[PDB]
A = this chain, B = another copy of it.
Amino acid sequence: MARWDPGAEQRLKRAALELYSEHGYDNVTVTDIAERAGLTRRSYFRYFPDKREVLFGGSELLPPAVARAVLAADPGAAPLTAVLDAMSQVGAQLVAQVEGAAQRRAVIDASPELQERERTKSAAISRAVQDALVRRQVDADTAELVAQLATVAFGSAFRRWIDAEGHADFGSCLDTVTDRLRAVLTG
């Protein structure tokens, strides 16, 4: 499907954002998305199973990937830095081009189903990170706090990154969020 048309998925993801933006999430079907992308309804299902996954498909972090990146980190590094670095490395593409980032955010924030959809994803990533941390001799209770904290920090930084419309590097946004989190915890 994409071997003879490598841009297929990208066109689908872009089409989705535009259609969800023009009309509303509830007013668009996978057929509309497929055709706007120059594909048939049947082809769509080779990439995504529903009209929801087209918003996450390749604009998310895969837990196994994040876990592996955490396992590969220098065991001497602080757990939080190791985790945030792993998330940034795995989401390098994501936090690279503000292109469509804001659109996607607007669509998700406007839909309760997509919001729950995102939380479920974040939980799975957090869980994968906990398991990797434990495999690295970090006690379970601590592993849980580090993963949850990282989830909060990365999510907030990403949001800030979107609001800066590209005028701020993801790194600075992350630095700002983590320094803020530290100030709140210490005062």
Q: Is the CB of A184 within 8 A of B152?
A: no
- A185: contacting residue among B123, B149, B155, CB under 8 A: B149
Interface 0/1 of A36-66, CB less than 8 Å to B: 0000000000000000000000000000000
Closest chain B residue to A151, Cβ basis: B152
| Copies of this chain | 2
Q: Is the interface of A mostly helix, strand, loop or mixed?
A: helix
A3 within 8 A of B: no
- Set of chain B residues within 8 Å of A178, measured between Cβ atoms: 185
Closest chain B residue to A139, Cβ basis: B180
- A182: contacting residue among B115, B144, B186, CB under 8 A: B186
- Set of chain B residues within 8 Å of A146, measured between Cβ atoms: 184
- Set of chain B residues within 8 Å of A99, measured between Cβ atoms: none
Q: How long is the Cα–Cα vector from A119 to B118 in the complex, in angstroms?
A: 11
Q: Is the CB of B149 within 8 A of A145?
A: no
- Set of chain B residues within 8 Å of A80, measured between Cβ atoms: 184-185
Q: How long is the Cα–Cα vector from A78 to B146 in the complex, in angstroms?
A: 23
A120 within 8 A of B: yes
Given contacts A116-B116, A123-B115, contact A180 B142 (CB under 8 A): yes
- Give the contacts of A158-187 with B (CB-CB under 8 A): 159-160, 177-178, 180-182, 184-187
